[PDB]
Amino acid sequence: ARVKRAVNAHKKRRSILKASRGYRGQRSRLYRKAKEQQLHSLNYAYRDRRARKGEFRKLWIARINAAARLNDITYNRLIQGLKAAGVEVDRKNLADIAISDPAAFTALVDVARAALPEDVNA
Amino acid sequence: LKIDVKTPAGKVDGAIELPAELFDVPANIALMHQVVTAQRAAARQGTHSTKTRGEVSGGGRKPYRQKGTGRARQGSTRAPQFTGGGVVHGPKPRDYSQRTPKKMIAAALRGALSDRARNGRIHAITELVEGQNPSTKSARAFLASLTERKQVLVVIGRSDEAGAKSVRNLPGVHILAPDQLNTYDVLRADDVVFSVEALNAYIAANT
Amino acid sequence: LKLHDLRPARGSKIARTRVGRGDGSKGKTAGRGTKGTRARKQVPVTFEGGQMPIHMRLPKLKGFRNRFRTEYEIVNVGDINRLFPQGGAVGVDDLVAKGAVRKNALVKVLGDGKLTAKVDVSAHKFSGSARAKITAAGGSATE
Amino acid sequence: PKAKTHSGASKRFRRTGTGKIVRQKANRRHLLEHKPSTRTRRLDGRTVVAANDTKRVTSLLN
RNA sequence: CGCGGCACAUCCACCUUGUGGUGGGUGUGGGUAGGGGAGCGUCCCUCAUUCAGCGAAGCCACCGGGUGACCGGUGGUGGA
RNA sequence: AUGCCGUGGUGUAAAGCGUGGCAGUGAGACGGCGGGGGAUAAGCUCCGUACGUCGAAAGGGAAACAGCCCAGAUCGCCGGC
RNA sequence: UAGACGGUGAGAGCCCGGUACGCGAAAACCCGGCACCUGCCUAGUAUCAAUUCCCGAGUAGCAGCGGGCCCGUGGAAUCCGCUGUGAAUCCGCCGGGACCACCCGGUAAGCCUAAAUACUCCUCGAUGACCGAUAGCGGAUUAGUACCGUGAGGGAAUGGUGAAAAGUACCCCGGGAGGGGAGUGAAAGAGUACCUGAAACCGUGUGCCUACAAUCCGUCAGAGCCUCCUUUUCCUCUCCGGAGGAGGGUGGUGAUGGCGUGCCUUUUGAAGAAUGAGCCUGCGAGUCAGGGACAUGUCGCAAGGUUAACCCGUGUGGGGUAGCCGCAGCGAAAGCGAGUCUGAAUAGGGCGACCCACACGCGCAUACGCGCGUGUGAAUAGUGGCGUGUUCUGGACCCGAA
Ligand SMILES: [Mg+2]
Ligand SMILES: [Mg+2]
Ligand SMILES: [Mg+2]
Ligand SMILES: [Mg+2]
Ligand SMILES: [Mg+2]
Ligand SMILES: [Mg+2]
Ligand SMILES: [Mg+2]
Ligand SMILES: [Mg+2]
Ligand SMILES: [Mg+2]
Numbered sequence A: 001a002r003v004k005r006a007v008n009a010h011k012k013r014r015s016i017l018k019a020s021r022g023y024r025g026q027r028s029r030l031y032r033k034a035k036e037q038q039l040h041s042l043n044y045a046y047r048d049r050r051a052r053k054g055e056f057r058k059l060w061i062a063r064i065n066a067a068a069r070l071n072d073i074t075y076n077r078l079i080q081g082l083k084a085a086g087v088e089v090d091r092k093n094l095a096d097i098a099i100s101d102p103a104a105f106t107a108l109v110d111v112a113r114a115a116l117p118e119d120v121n122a
Numbered sequence B: 001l002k003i004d005v006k007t008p009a010g011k012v013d014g015a016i017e018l019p020a021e022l023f024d025v026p027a028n029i030a031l032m033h034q035v036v037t038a039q040r041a042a043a044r045q046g047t048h049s050t051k052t053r054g055e056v057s058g059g060g061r062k063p064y065r066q067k068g069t070g071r072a073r074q075g076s077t078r079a080p081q082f083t084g085g086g087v088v089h090g091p092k093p094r095d096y097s098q099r100t101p102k103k104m105i106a107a108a109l110r111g112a113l114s115d116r117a118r119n120g121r122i123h124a125i126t127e128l129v130e131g132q133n134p135s136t137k138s139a140r141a142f143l144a145s146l147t148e149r150k151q152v153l154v155v156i157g158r159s160d161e162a163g164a165k166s167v168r169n170l171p172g173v174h175i176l177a178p179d180q181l182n183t184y185d186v187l188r189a190d191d192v193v194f195s196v197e198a199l200n201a202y203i204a205a206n207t
Numbered sequence C: 001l002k003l004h005d006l007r008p009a010r011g012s013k014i015a016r017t018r019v020g021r022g023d024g025s026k027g028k029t030a031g032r033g034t035k036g037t038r039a040r041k042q043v044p045v046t047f048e049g050g051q052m053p054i055h056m057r058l059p060k061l062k063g064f065r066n067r068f069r070t071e072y073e074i075v076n077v078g079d080i081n082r083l084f085p086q087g088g089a090v091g092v093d094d095l096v097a098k099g100a101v102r103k104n105a106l107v108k109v110l111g112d113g114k115l116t117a118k119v120d121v122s123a124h125k126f127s128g129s130a131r132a133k134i135t136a137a138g139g140s141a142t143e
Numbered sequence D: 001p002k003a004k005t006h007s008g009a010s011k012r013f014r015r016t017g018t019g020k021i022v023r024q025k026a027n028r029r030h031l032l033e034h035k036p037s038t039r040t041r042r043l044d045g046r047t048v049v050a051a052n053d054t055k056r057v058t059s060l061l062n
Numbered sequence E: 001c002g003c004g005g006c007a008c009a010u011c012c013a014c015c016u017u018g019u020g021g022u023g024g025g026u027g028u029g030g031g032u033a034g035g036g037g038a039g040c041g042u043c044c045c046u047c048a049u050u051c052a053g054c055g056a057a058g059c060c061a062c063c064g065g066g067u068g069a070c071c072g073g074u075g076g077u078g079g080a
Numbered sequence F: 001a002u003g004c005c006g007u008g009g010u011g012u013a014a015a016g017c018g019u020g021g022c023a024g025u026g027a028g029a030c031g032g033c034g035g036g037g038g039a040u041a042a043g044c045u046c047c048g049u050a051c052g053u054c055g056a057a058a059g060g061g062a063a064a065c066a067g068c069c070c071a072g073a074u075c076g077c078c079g080g081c
Numbered sequence G: 001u002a003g004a005c006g007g008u009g010a011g012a013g014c015c016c017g018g019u020a021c022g023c024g025a026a027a028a029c030c031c032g033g034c035a036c037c038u039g040c041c042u043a044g045u046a047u048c049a050a051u052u053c054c055c056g057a058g059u060a061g062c063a064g065c066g067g068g069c070c071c072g073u074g075g076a077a078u079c080c081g082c083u084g085u086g087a088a089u090c091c092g093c094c095g096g097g098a099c100c101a102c103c104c105g106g107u108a109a110g111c112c113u114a115a116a117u118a119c120u121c122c123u124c125g126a127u128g129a130c131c132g133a134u135a136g137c138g139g140a141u142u143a144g145u146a147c148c149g150u151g152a153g154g155g156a157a158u159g160g161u162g163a164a165a166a167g168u169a170c171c172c173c174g175g176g177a178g179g180g181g182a183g184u185g186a187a188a189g190a191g192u193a194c195c196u197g198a199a200a201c202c203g204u205g206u207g208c209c210u211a212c213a214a215u216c217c218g219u220c221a222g223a224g225c226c227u228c229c230u231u232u233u234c235c236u237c238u239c240c241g242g243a244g245g246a247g248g249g250u251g252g253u254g255a256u257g258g259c260g261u262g263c264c265u266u267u268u269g270a271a272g273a274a275u276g277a278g279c280c281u282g283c284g285a286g287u288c289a290g291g292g293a294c295a296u297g298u299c300g301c302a303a304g305g306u307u308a309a310c311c312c313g314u315g316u317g318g319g320g321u322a323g324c325c326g327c328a329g330c331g332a333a334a335g336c337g338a339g340u341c342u343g344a345a346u347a348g349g350g351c352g353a354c355c356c357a358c359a360c361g362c363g364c365a366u367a368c369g370c371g372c373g374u375g376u377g378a379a380u381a382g383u384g385g386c387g388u389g390u391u392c393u394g395g396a397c398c399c400g401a402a
């Protein structure tokens, strides 16, 4: 039983070339180059699906710092004070509030400042 | 266990008792599977063949010098990587056939026949065509009287050339002598129709 | 019934390993790994790297083998007692028929086991204990 | 093709009634004047082949 | 650590109470050489069954699906 | 001082031992500590070390930076420490 | 008695060639019979005598040197060659593994002899879990051709319109080639560059982006455009349909921000300035044989298991006991044997055999049990087939020298 290879062999080629659309140069036209690019791309996507969890926290913390310093308090002491007051809202929603409802953010800053200890160096 | 013998163009005349040690054996599925596989393996020819690089025509000398050309090292034009060259581990004429023990073969055949008898697919007749000349029309009418299924195994004696010819080219009908019964044919048939003397001969050959 | 109903017993047939068919199985070296001899050839069982091998640094077993040696097929009085509870005559043909001894061979009777049945054993080359046990049981031992 | 056994191995090893493989011992052919009777008696007899050699000697014998 | 999915091994209780499944804990799940276990796709044969000039195979596009190799649906082209 | 041998308790699932099937490996590198050769030079060389890492280990730190510090990736999350 | 196979405008037992079955030979050749013809047989059988002659000559034997036998010169028989020497005719001679004696067997140095066995250039008839145009023969095509070499030699590539040629009359542009319109055809999305018609590669049109930026060419975040669907307030012309607006969703593009040192091989360590790869398509590497060896999974039978050659059957079926493995070991061996060897040993060791979770009687202990016969019911095992891993002999996973 002699078997021609074409029918089985093109199944993976079509999927690689279909996932490699939009790459410039040989990387979208040639199967051997698209295969290497796909290796790199899926490793990159794996790495980035875990890096963006820190990336978004970085962005939220930056915006919370801006809003807090606008309301005359450091992000540092705002976080300490909110934990002391026992407020369990997370940074995503703190940043959302700082963008949308500055009056509510000011109220939160007042709560954190009130709960903060009288002398922060003891 | 008790089969009644039917006659062409008529009704019953006698009866035959099937011994339980030949028609009431349990069905060993794995055993029958091995036996049937061995049968089909022995049915092959295995007349496939290819040519190795030693048998492809020509290709004796080294095509060019080893060094100084910038090309790969080749050694022969009939090497397997060449178009038109030899085949590596290609098919060669084989003999597919197995040495299944006689006890296993006989046990599988007995189990298959027991399954047929237990489901009631064993029929016994005197002879197929009441004349001395073949007649497929009447033979087919008689078989259709006995059976409404497609695959039928007709077991008749080797001396009934008048009755073998009658059902010879009926589709779905298979003919074999009582001393050539086998698991594959029994298991492919839906009903097994014995001639009375064929059944008696098969029973006597096993006591 | 119905050939499309036969399947082999579980564990009876398992697929062969194909050894040069990609990284998810035995990948490219096909289990060889090496770069040395074993990557392309086999090493003979007799080779030991150049030191004197085990089959050459040991002395030959002493003695000769007798070209003219006679071999007896043996049977024990315990087997005789088991096989002939009723007693009676016990010949070499009876022994081969009962399957206690190979055919067309000289038979020697040995004396292992308990013999109680009165028997009349005819054979070659009885043992010392076999004769005593047979005669104590009450039979006879002819050659 | 029928498998051939090893001549020298079959001359130097043999099996017992339970399948153990036994051998003789070396250093006992000549130069025996300076060897005490303790050493010669130790070298006398037959011994079971070592567990680290049993596989290869079995392959040689079969 | 939290919440959800998967797998291996094992413990605790049932269904054939280890042929194997059912429920809950617990531990484990980076990997080259290499060992073991289970699968996908192609072709040919046998048995049963089912589609096809009211359009098979092959090819192309789109929409979907599975833990993986991969699969399905619709349409186009085509002609066994 | 450590290390080593034995022994009695306690703890610990994936330790150990015997016997078989199938292996690969037998070019190591750096770092810490103790030494030889060297000029008490080498990213030198040769040993020891129930020492580590790389090899075969991704992630964070060290500007970059196999072998240093932290820490061992089953998959997902726009949660937290 | 025909449902083999193939063809015919698409899967045909009944349309065709055929198939089952049955007939058919002037002549030539082959085989058989009957004759002709040719040849052989024209008394020696038996008994006694045991004197004589004969029974294959440069032969046998012997020696030297070699060949070949399981036998590599060895204690080297048997067989064959050359050189030398060189018999005997039955009261002889040769063989029985140096040689001698006895016994047994046979009758060298003359010739012929069927069958059982091997093979296929070739001719007929079938078949294939064989190939299907880079495959299968080198050769489906001018094939041992073209072409290459002084020569011996080496040695290719090239199949497919359609059911039918109905192979595009006629007109137009053009020197033609080629095309457009008509026309044939089910189809010209079949036009002799012709079945289907992938990819690399080359155009044309079009949506978005791109001329202040340092890019293993992607990935995550991400505005804005364009496209097509949909929930709103509106053109209510609304049966409308949707222009647009607001939202949402597909799909395309990606201004801008972060992260980010190709794949393979081989290495202590490679993005490496170490190796290999221009690209696509096709092809290209652990296979097979054997009652081989070892080990395992599974099935049959079981103290037995199993046949080989071969015989009979249209087959895969039935026979076939020769043999092999298991059944007792120990020892160099004679031998002995549940034991045997060593040994002076009734000393000890080596190897090999030998169940108690239990009762009965028994010498037996507080008990534990020591050996014997049974059960209280005490646990064995081999062998044949088929898979799989490794291995042996073969080219043995594939390619490669000088
Ligand atoms: Mg893009
Ligand atoms: Mg995190
Ligand atoms: Mg050649
Ligand atoms: Mg060569
Ligand atoms: Mg060719
Ligand atoms: Mg070829
Ligand atoms: Mg047979
Ligand atoms: Mg590779
Ligand atoms: Mg291996």
Ligand SMILES: [Mg+2]
Residues within 6 Å of the ligand: C033, C034, C035, C036, C038, C039
């Ligand atoms: Mg190696």
Ligand SMILES: [Mg+2]
Residues within 6 Å of the ligand: C035
């Ligand atoms: Mg190496």
Ligand SMILES: [Mg+2]
Residues within 6 Å of the ligand: none
């Ligand atoms: Mg290599």
Ligand SMILES: [Mg+2]
Residues within 6 Å of the ligand: C044
């Ligand atoms: Mg060898």
Ligand SMILES: [Mg+2]
Residues within 6 Å of the ligand: C050
């Ligand atoms: Mg040496």
Ligand SMILES: [Mg+2]
Residues within 6 Å of the ligand: D029
């Ligand atoms: Mg000596």
Ligand SMILES: [Mg+2]
Residues within 6 Å of the ligand: D032, D035, D036, D037, D040
């Ligand atoms: Mg001495």
Ligand SMILES: [Mg+2]
Residues within 6 Å of the ligand: none
């Ligand atoms: Mg893992």
Ligand SMILES: [Mg+2]
Residues within 6 Å of the ligand: E034
């Ligand atoms: Mg691996």
Ligand SMILES: [Mg+2]
Residues within 6 Å of the ligand: E053
């Ligand atoms: Mg049509």
Ligand SMILES: [Mg+2]
Residues within 6 Å of the ligand: none
């Ligand atoms: Mg096909």
Ligand SMILES: [Mg+2]
Residues within 6 Å of the ligand: none
């Ligand atoms: Mg479709």
Ligand SMILES: [Mg+2]
Residues within 6 Å of the ligand: none
């Ligand atoms: Mg289609």
Ligand SMILES: [Mg+2]
Residues within 6 Å of the ligand: none
């Ligand atoms: Mg092991």
Ligand SMILES: [Mg+2]
Residues within 6 Å of the ligand: F026
């Ligand atoms: Mg070495």
Ligand SMILES: [Mg+2]
Residues within 6 Å of the ligand: none
């Ligand atoms: Mg070394």
